[PDB]
Amino acid sequence: VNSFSGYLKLTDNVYIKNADIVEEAKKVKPTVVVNAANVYLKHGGGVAGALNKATNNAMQVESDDYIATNGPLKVGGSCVLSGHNLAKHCLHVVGPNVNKGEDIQLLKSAYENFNQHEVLLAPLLSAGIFGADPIHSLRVCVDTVRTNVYLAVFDKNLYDKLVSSFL
Ligand SMILES: CC(=O)Nc1ncc(S(=O)(=O)NC(=O)C2(c3ccc(Cl)c(Cl)c3)CCC2)s1
Structure with a gap:
């Protein structure tokens, strides 16, 4: 049993809610x-x-130190940093950005990072301004x-289309 409430169950392990990931994280503290x-x-x-703004830019400050030490991530890769006031940890995952011409096949590699964590609150990778098809x-x-992944979709219009088209 966990504290995630108001989710539609899609499969054994995937759940989806119409929620602002910022406010869901603040509520749940995953x-x-x-x-x-x-x-x-x-x-x-x-x-x-949005997440960074909710941390008062502390996420950005921490991230700049991470990059100065380690260099950039890979598309499809991730790193674990602090969750600040939102969560214990933040898993920064790089999905491919279609608006940069990046390989959509890397989306599967990006999602594989989630398997290193028993439970996560997450957005759909490569959605929105990353230009991919959210249904895909x-x-x-x-x-x-x-x-166990709890997906938070802000836009109600998109959420309903995702539910109504799910196989
Ligand atoms: C504060 C904040 O951004 N919180 C998020 N939580 C979840 C998401 S998302 O990754 O599911 N993206 C979305 O819902 C879209 C969206 C459409 C319209 C608006 Cl007004 C917003 Cl904010 C977001 C982009 C693709 C639909 S964004």
Whole structure:
């Protein structure tokens, strides 16, 4: 039993809610919240901009130190950093950005990072300003993630389309 409430069950291990990931993280304080990161951990917009804003830019400060020490992530890769006021940990995961011309096949590799964590609050990878088809992202999620994932979708219109098209 966990504290995630108001989720539709899609499969044995995948759940989906119409919720702002920022507010869901603040409410639940999950062990892991996933960020829709880029390789430079520059949290300017989309999910990342919103999560970082909610940390009062502390996520960005921590991220800049991480990059100065370690260099950029790989597309499809991830790192674990602090969750600040939102979660114990933040798993920064880099899905491919279609608007940069990046390989959509890397989406499966990106979701594989979730399997290193027993339970996660997450957005759909490569959705929104990353330019992928969110229905495809949900399919890859369900077919790749084996741990317990709670997906938060802000847009009600999108959420209903995701539910109504799910096989
Ligand atoms: C604060 C914040 O951004 N919180 C998020 N939680 C979850 C998400 S998301 O990754 O599911 N993206 C979305 O819902 C979209 C969206 C459409 C319209 C608006 Cl107004 C917003 Cl904010 C987001 C982008 C693709 C639909 S963004």
